[PDB]
Write a protein that binds this ligand. Structure first.
Ligand SMILES: CC(=O)O[C@H]1C(=O)[C@@]2(C)[C@H]([C@H](OC(=O)c3ccccc3)[C@]3(O)C[C@H](OC(=O)[C@H](O)[C@@H](NC(=O)c4ccccc4)c4ccccc4)C(C)=C1C3(C)C)[C@]1(OC(C)=O)CO[C@@H]1C[C@@H]2O
Ligand SMILES: Nc1nc2c(ncn2[C@@H]2O[C@H](COP(=O)(O)OP(=O)(O)OP(=O)(O)O)[C@@H](O)[C@H]2O)c(=O)[nH]1
Ligand SMILES: Nc1ncnc2c1ncn2[C@@H]1O[C@H](COP(=O)(O)OP(=O)(O)NP(=O)(O)O)[C@@H](O)[C@H]1O
Ligand SMILES: Nc1nc2c(ncn2[C@@H]2O[C@H](COP(=O)(O)OP(=O)(O)O)[C@@H](O)[C@H]2O)c(=O)[nH]1
Ligand SMILES: [Mg+2]
Lengths: 345, 441, 429
């Protein structure tokens, strides 16, 4: 079992909050990301493996959208060609800079298309006769611990959504029963299928923001390395397979501060449990490498259950936290960083 | 007039009130139904004392208190017991379901839609009072109600009533003894709020009073209605200067000043030295010096913390009965001459003193004895950090594995909130180290 | 007003319930007709926890009997306390399950369950507040193994924010009363770890031992084993009905006794059980009940806690007592017997008290416990399973009613995975 990698990325500022002209709390002495209140009763200091400083375009070591790819995401691609599975997560609440980093906008790209483009580049470089690759994409979510596919039946069909169910092949692993995945050939089809999905992610308008996601979106790609017929006969190790998972999680959203009942409270309760189990899984998996007999609780959550074959074994994991530099979110921001520490140790 | 509103949250607060009022009604001359026979016979005096009991024109007397537990199994013993014709029927049961020993239930999901009645009855009782100066609260740090409803209530009352003393006579969990395996959690999350909102939070521990009940009262098999009858005596020694006369009187806006150096260290202790039995009541003098010295003994403390591992920042001494001042000003000098008892360099004055003329009352069916004098100490010590750390360690032992946490997030809670509360509990065990340091120049 | 909806499922559940209502009625003062013939007022203040009311000061119970293929409607109705149940609640069908988990989950259950739930609604909405459900079934058969668990799923979907207690009889390490016990048990545990908050793993051999060693009964029938299970069934829900000093509920005993969700398989016990001769030569105090409870002979689970570590135990006391004795005696166990407990929970025991004891005693008790020794109960079936599933043993009677082989494998892994969560916490860290 390999090590989990954890990083942090601070957004510059939002023009919406800038009407208030609130203050700055986060500071960076290289890799010790210090936090300070306006009162300065205490001063917190968090140390992580990696740290991205995107507060303003003055400081050296500014981490442009390019800098995340070569630093965190490109090794996932380099290992996927070796047959090993990979996973990337993303943890931050509404307004953190999360979907800016996953995909960005058409002019400032994120992590998904810049990854899937270099993927096809290294394919077309090695699309020889001895080797021939095949890609397949799927995109689903988790709402109240129910799996839904974002690319099926488009709603308005009597019923609302299709609650698929998870099962366990004995040797292949966990899987979803009823997920017509897709086939791809190049990059634009991925963008079309993904724009078709995110419109149907079951978001909801909480008081803090009009668009706040209440689902853990999962994007899975499957890569195969088929080889050719050897001279003696028709048998050749052509089943080298790999699986790339990219998750866009939701925010913790504590409910005492945000007076929410009825259905948002159930959503929140489903979101805080998945996050807790995910943290427990990552901590156990990072404690197994250091030498210990520990049980990894996959089965206590669906997102940790379907991805059992992507975290354990000899696979690689990665996590990106996103925090606001303001003081208004100081109780929110700190929580994220605290979770990241639990992933590091 | 002077008044004090007494709130009683949870089973602990209810079982304490059922003794506190049993004592007050007897101190003032009130039957369990409400009617006093003394006012018609003697024809004078304010024995219907307005600090706790309001009066109706029909000769009836109505207490200034409220009850709420989110479980009707307790208060229904009042609505069907001996004290039913006294209390207002608005004893806010809302117990369609209990709070499962988790703060997340007493805070949001069974603590909302119930609190409005509480904050309405408190307004109704405050409108009846002219010179209100106190919101006493009785709860327990351990349970979901005492931890959650109390924090949902104090944060509301600090908005509503604001510049008004609040006092929490709470039950701190014991190190070894316990009746639950979540008290290390429900206690830390409470401090994170009451530390900011409350003004002076006393603390008692059932282990200490158990020990007191065997080494002094000769009871080998005690129950809770023996300890609650000592807690009632504490609250009566506190609230006596409000009701009865005395040479040196002490109001509730004086503990808040002479025992609270900084706003975050308002967690004192409490004692009551003569708890002697009717057999040992004879064979003994029970003078001011003996009692005052007994208040400074570790064995007689109603909280489990060796005060010799720390220093005293302040201390009050509320006497009750036949006492003379120079007996007191001779008793304290013997304490300052002693080298086991320490005092911070920033408080040589140290002592607040209070005297009252009304002696205690002996509740029948009881273990306490008749005494011509009785005392209650209220000390602020730097030793109770060692009692706080014992909880914090437990937290760190059952949060590294994230145990029992899903029962909290399952009822409206975030993981990081637990971490934030632990950070708040660590800042306070550091300030106690700051105050304990001798200055240098 | 907290309220419990009982459900019977199968022969075991029907007989055990028939003996449980015979033990709650006596506790409350109700006769076979439904009339009140009590002596105290404190039996009616909270009679709503199990019984509904009716016209002539009568009281009807909230039972929902379910057993495809009858043979027991006659046995309960004809019995002494049978004509108190609601006849519309006598649900049943023909074509018995035949000791198959499939016929009681897929074929015959699917065409009966929609008539069962239609009573739960009719018996749930009438409750002012609902604390949870109480099922009584036995693994090994078809009704208790399949139909009860299907009901559990259908009810945890509708009423999720509640408690589904399930007091389950389990197979044994020796002679059994059914040949296909392992497969039904495996396929039930897969559906009882994900959809349940508190289950009691009762075994019959531990009850034969309790009846032959302590009680010194020579010819014990099934109507004497249930007379022990009913004790626990009443003792758990006493802090809702009767008052006390430290009250409780089904949710306090589920928040403290379940550190992680899957580990909700408990290990019950009742004290003071004794022979008629040794009743004159004993004393009734707290420590006697404590020793009789923590002893490995009074547990009903066919597992030895001395082979494992207690994660969390409970003790619902009943009687006029002193908490100075209770807390002291429950701390003495943690201090003396430390290796039988875990260190990453500081205190491993809570206490509950009620001031109102049993009809003929002065102080009773009821012990719940969450040990790792339940490992040994599920390390057995998973062997039997993989002693049979390999050769494709009595399985054509399962595939022949709409079940693939994969469903047999999944339930084998989850159980095994559960065994690897109890055994994680059985050695020093
Ligand atoms: C002088 C005396 O002690 O009489 C006892 C008695 O001797 C003993 C042996 C009773 C006796 O019970 C048994 O012998 C027995 C037989 C088979 C299986 C289990 C028990 C007793 O019959 C049983 C009976 O128990 C009760 O009445 C409780 O209410 C019990 N309910 C019923 O027994 C009951 C059953 C069906 C119909 C009506 C009532 C109960 C238990 C737990 C929770 C609530 C109620 C009692 C006190 C006794 C006798 C009568 C001898 C004991 O019963 C229980 C469950 O406590 C057996 O061990 C206890 C210890 C008692 O000492
Ligand atoms: N001194 C004293 N303490 C009590 C008494 N009753 C309960 N306690 C304490 O209260 C704690 C339990 O929490 P409580 O707040 O009383 O529980 P509750 O009030 O019923 O509310 P829930 O937790 O929701 O059940 C235990 O740790 C006891 O030590 C009492 O009568 N006297
Ligand atoms: N690294 C960055 N550098 C520069 N600008 C940034 C950066 N990250 C975020 N921003 C800006 O801040 C905005 C972040 O807000 P927004 O994109 O709405 O949050 P979001 O993460 O996309 N919503 P959600 O998916 O719920 O987290 C972006 O749209 C940019 O305008
Ligand atoms: N304790 C007890 N167990 C019983 C009784 N009747 C049957 N059993 C047990 O139930 C198991 C068989 O399950 P069964 O009742 O036939 O379930 P069903 O086939 O669905 O009705 C066996 O292990 C028996 O030991 C009873 O009256 N009391
Ligand atoms: Mg309670």
């Amino acid at each position: 079992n390999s090590q989990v990698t954890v990083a942090v990325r601070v957004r510059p500022f939002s023009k919406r909050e800038k009407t208030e002209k609130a203050s700055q709390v986060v500071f960076t002495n290289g890799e010790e990301i210090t936090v300070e209140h306006p009162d300065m009763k205490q001063v917190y200091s968090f140390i992580y493996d990696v740290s991205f400083w995107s507060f303003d375009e003055c400081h050296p070591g500014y981490a442009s959208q390019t800098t995340v790819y070569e630093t965190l995401a490109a090794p996932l691609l380099d290992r996927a060609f070796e047959g090993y599975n990979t996973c990337l997560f993303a943890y931050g609440q509404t307004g953190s800079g999360k979907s800016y980093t996953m995909m960005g906008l058409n002019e400032e790209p994120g992590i998904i298309p810049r990854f899937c483009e270099d993927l096809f580049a290294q394919i077309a470089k090695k699309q020889t006769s001895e080797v021939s690759y095949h890609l397949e994409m799927s995109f689903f979510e988790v709402y109240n611990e129910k799996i839904h596919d974002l690319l099926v039946c488009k709603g308005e069909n009597g019923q609302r959504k299709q609650p698929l169910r998870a099962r366990e092949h004995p040797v292949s692993g966990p899987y979803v029963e009823g997920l017509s995945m897709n086939v791809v050939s190049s990059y634009s089809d991925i963008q079309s299928w993904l724009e078709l999905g995110n419109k149907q992610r079951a978001t909801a308008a909480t008081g803090m923001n009009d668009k706040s996601s209440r689902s853990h979106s999962v994007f899975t790609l499957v890569m195969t390395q088929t080889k050719t017929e050897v001279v003696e006969g028709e048998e050749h190790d052509h089943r080298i397979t790999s699986r790339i998972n990219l998750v866009d999680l939701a925010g913790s959203e504590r409910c005492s501060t945000a007076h929410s009942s009825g259905q948002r409270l159930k959503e929140g309760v489903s979101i805080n449990k998945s996050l807790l189990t995910l943290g427990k899984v990552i901590s156990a998996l990072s404690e197994q490498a250091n030498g210990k007999r520990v049980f990894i609780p996959y089965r206590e959550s669906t997102l940790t259950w379907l991805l059992k074959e992507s975290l354990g074994g000899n696979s690689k994991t990665a996590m990106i936290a996103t925090v606001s530099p303001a003081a208004s979110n100081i109780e929110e921001t700190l929580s994220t960083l605290r979770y990241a520490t639990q992933a590091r140790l | 007039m002077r008044e004090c509103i007494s709130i009683h949250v949870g089973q602990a607060g209810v079982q304490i009130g059922n003794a506190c009022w049993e004592l007050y009604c007897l101190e003032h001359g009130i039957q369990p139904d409400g009617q006093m026979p003394s006012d018609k016979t003697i024809g004078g005096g304010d024995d219907s004392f307005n600090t706790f009991f309001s009066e109706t024109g029909a000769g009836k007397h109505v207490p200034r208190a409220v009850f709420v537990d989110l479980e009707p199994t307790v208060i229904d013993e009042v609505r069907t017991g001996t004290y039913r014709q006294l209390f207002h029927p608005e004893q806010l049961i809302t117990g369609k379901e209990d709070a499962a020993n988790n703060y997340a239930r007493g805070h949001y999901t069974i603590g909302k839609e119930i609190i409005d009645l509480v904050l309405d009855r408190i307004r109704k009782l405050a409108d009846q009072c002219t010179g209100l100066q106190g919101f006493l609260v009785f709860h327990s740090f351990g349970g979901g109600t005492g931890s959650g409803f109390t924090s949902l209530l104090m944060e509301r009352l600090s908005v509503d009533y604001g510049k008004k003393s609040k006092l929490e006579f709470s039950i701190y969990p014991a190190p070894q003894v316990s009746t639950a395996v979540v008290e290390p959690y429900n206690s830390i999350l409470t401090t994170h709020t009451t530390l900011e909102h409350s003004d002076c939070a006393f603390m008692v521990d059932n282990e200490a009073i158990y020990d007191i009940c065997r080494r002094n009262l000769d009871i080998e098999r005690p129950t809770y209605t023996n300890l609650n009858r000592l807690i009632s005596q504490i609250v009566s020694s506190i609230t006596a200067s409000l009701r009865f006369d005395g040479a040196l009187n002490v109001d509730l806006t004086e503990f808040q000043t002479n025992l609270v150096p900084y706003p975050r260290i308002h967690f004192p202790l409490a004692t009551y030295a003569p708890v002697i039995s009717a057999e040992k009541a004879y064979h003994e003098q029970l003078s001011v010096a003996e009692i005052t010295n007994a208040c400074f003994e570790p064995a007689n403390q109603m909280v489990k913390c060796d005060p010799r591992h720390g220093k005293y920042m302040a201390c009050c001494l509320l006497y009750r009965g036949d006492v003379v001042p120079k007996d007191v000003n001779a008793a304290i000098a013997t304490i300052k001459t002693k080298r086991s008892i320490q005092f911070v360099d920033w408080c040589p004055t140290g002592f607040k003193v209070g005297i009252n003329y009304q002696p205690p009352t002996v509740v029948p069916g009881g273990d306490l004895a008749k005494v011509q004098r009785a005392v209650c100490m209220l000390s602020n010590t730097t030793a109770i950090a060692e009692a706080w750390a014992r909880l914090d360690h437990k937290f760190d032992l059952m949060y590294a594995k994230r145990a029992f946490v899903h029962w909290y997030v399952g009822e409206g809670m975030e993981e990081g909130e637990f971490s934030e509360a632990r950070e708040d509990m660590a800042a306070l065990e550091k300030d106690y180290e700051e105050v304990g340091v001798d200055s240098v120049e | 007003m907290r309220e419990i909806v009982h459900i019977q499922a199968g022969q075991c559940g029907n007989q055990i319930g028939a003996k449980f209502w015979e033990v709650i009625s006596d506790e409350h003062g109700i006769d076979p007709t439904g009339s009140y013939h009590g002596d105290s007022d404190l039996q009616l203040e909270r009679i709503n926890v199990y019984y509904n009311e009716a016209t002539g000061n009568k009281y009807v119970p909230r039972a929902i009997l379910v057993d495809l293929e009858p043979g027991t409607m006659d046995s309960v109705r004809s019995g002494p306390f049978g004509q108190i149940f609601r006849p519309d609640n006598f649900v049943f069908g023909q074509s018995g399950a035949g000791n198959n988990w499939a016929k009681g989950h897929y074929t015959e259950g699917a065409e009966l369950v929609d008539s069962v739930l239609d009573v739960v609604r009719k018996e749930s909405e009438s409750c002012d507040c609902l604390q949870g459900f109480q099922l009584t079934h036995s693994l090994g058969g078809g009704t208790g193994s399949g139909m009860g668990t299907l009901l559990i799923s259908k009810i945890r979907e509708e009423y999720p924010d509640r408690i589904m207690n399930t007091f389950s009889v389990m197979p044994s390490p020796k002679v059994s009363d059914t040949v296909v016990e392992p497969y039904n048990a495996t396929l039930s545990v897969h559906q009882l770890v994900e959809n349940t908050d508190e289950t009691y793993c009762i075994d019959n051999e531990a009850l034969y031992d309790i009846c032959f060693r302590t009680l010194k009964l020579t010819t014990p029938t099934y109507g004497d084993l249930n007379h022990l299970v009913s004790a626990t069934m009443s003792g758990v829900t006493t802090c809702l009905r009767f008052p006390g000093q430290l009250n409780a509920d089904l949710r306090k005993l589920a928040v403290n006794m379940v550190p992680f969700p899957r580990l909700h398989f408990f290990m019950p016990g009742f004290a003071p059980l004794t022979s008629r001769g040794s009743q004159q030569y004993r004393a009734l105090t707290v420590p006697e009940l404590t020793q009789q409870m923590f002893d490995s002979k009074n547990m009903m689970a066919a597992c030895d806690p001395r082979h494992g570590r207690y994660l969390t135990v409970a003790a619902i006391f009943r009687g006029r007592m002193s908490m100075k004795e209770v807390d002291e005696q429950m701390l003495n166990v943690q201090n003396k017997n430390s290796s039988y407990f875990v260190e990453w929970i500081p205190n491993n025991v809570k206490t509950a008290v009620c001031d109102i004891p049993p009809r003929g005693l002065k102080m009773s008790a009821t012990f719940i416990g969450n040990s790792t020794a339940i490992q040994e109960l599920f390390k057995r079936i998973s062997e039997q399973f993989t002693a049979m599933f390999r050769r494709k043993a009595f399985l054509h009677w399962y595939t022949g009613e709409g079940m693939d082989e994969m469903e047999f494998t999944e339930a084998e892994s989850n159980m095994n995975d559960l065994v690897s969560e109890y055994q994680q916490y059985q050695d020093a860290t």
